Amino acid sequence: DHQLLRYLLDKD
Amino acid sequence: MELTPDQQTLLHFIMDSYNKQRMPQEITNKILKEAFSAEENFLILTEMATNHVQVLVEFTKKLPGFQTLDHEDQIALLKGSAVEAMFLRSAEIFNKKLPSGHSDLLEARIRNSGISDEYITPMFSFYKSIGELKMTQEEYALLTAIVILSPDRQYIKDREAVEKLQEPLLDVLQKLCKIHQPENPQHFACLLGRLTELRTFNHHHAEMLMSWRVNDHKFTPLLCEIWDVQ
Ligand SMILES: O=C(O)c1ccc(NC(=O)[C@H](C2CCCCC2)n2c(-c3ccc(Cl)cc3)nc3cc(F)c(F)cc32)cc1
Numbered sequence: 001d002h003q004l005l006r007y008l009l010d011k012d
Numbered sequence: 013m014e015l016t017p018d019q020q021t022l023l024h025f026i027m028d029s030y031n032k033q034r035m036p037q038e039i040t041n042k043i044l045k046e047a048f049s050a051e052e053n054f055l056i057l058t059e060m061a062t063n064h065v066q067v068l069v070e071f072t073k074k075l076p077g078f079q080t081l082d083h084e085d086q087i088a089l090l091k092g093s094a095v096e097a098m099f100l101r102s103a104e105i106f107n108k109k110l111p112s113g114h115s116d117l118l119e120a121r122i123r124n125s126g127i128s129d130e131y132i133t134p135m136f137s138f139y140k141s142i143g144e145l146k147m148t149q150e151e152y153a154l155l156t157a158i159v160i161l162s163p164d165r166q167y168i169k170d171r172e173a174v175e176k177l178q179e180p181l182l183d184v185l186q187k188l189c190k191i192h193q194p195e196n197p198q199h200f201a202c203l204l205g206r207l208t209e210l211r212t213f214n215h216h217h218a219e220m221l222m223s224w225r226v227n228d229h230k231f232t233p234l235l236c237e238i239w240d241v242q
Binding site: 003004006008009 | 064069073086087090091124233234237238
């Protein structure tokens, strides 16, 4: 669980 | 052997992604202009490292097949590579040709930044060794991609799939070494050796930030995620 890392990965 | 059109296409695409980073001139002009306190330099480090990761995630996502990987493997790859990538990048910047004396002043500045002396020696020893390698931008970009796509990262559930991804980048880098440095057949192996040298910095990363000569060590929440801090 690393929301920002997962957010940066998934977004776009 | 020479690059095939498909490796040339791959290399160019990789460079495009890679060029999206903050210019090294920007960074060295900031350090060289005025000297700062340890607290001020800590701030610059956290910002620089915050922007470095954001760019790194973008570079990583553009790597061929990266998005085909298991979600949890992708995370373990980013965490496993962020610090090493930042150090390899710091080494690239350090080695950019500057007007006479600036090289010496940048080193002296960084040396005063606030980092403990235990880390300055292995840090500059690495930078000056990497510098000796005389790598092109392409070599830094491919070696960065090679570092990110390491099957050997702790927590990788399918090493085999990561190996399939890193495999074509290793081949391209090797060809560049034979092209750009054919008076040194050991060149490619030296590059791979320096990667083992990079992992050791990663082992002590949290300590080197924790030991920075400052009272309070405040990190952005993104940095707390990448860096095993706070
Ligand atoms: O691509 C990016 O966007 C990017 C990547 C990397 C850095 N790195 C930095 O700003 C820090 C500063 C940070 C401010 C204080 C002086 C060093 N930095 C480190 C260092 C030392 C120790 C630790 Cl723990 C991490 C790093 N070694 C450097 C060698 C250099 F020649 C240099 F110019 C800056 C350097 C900047 C930007």
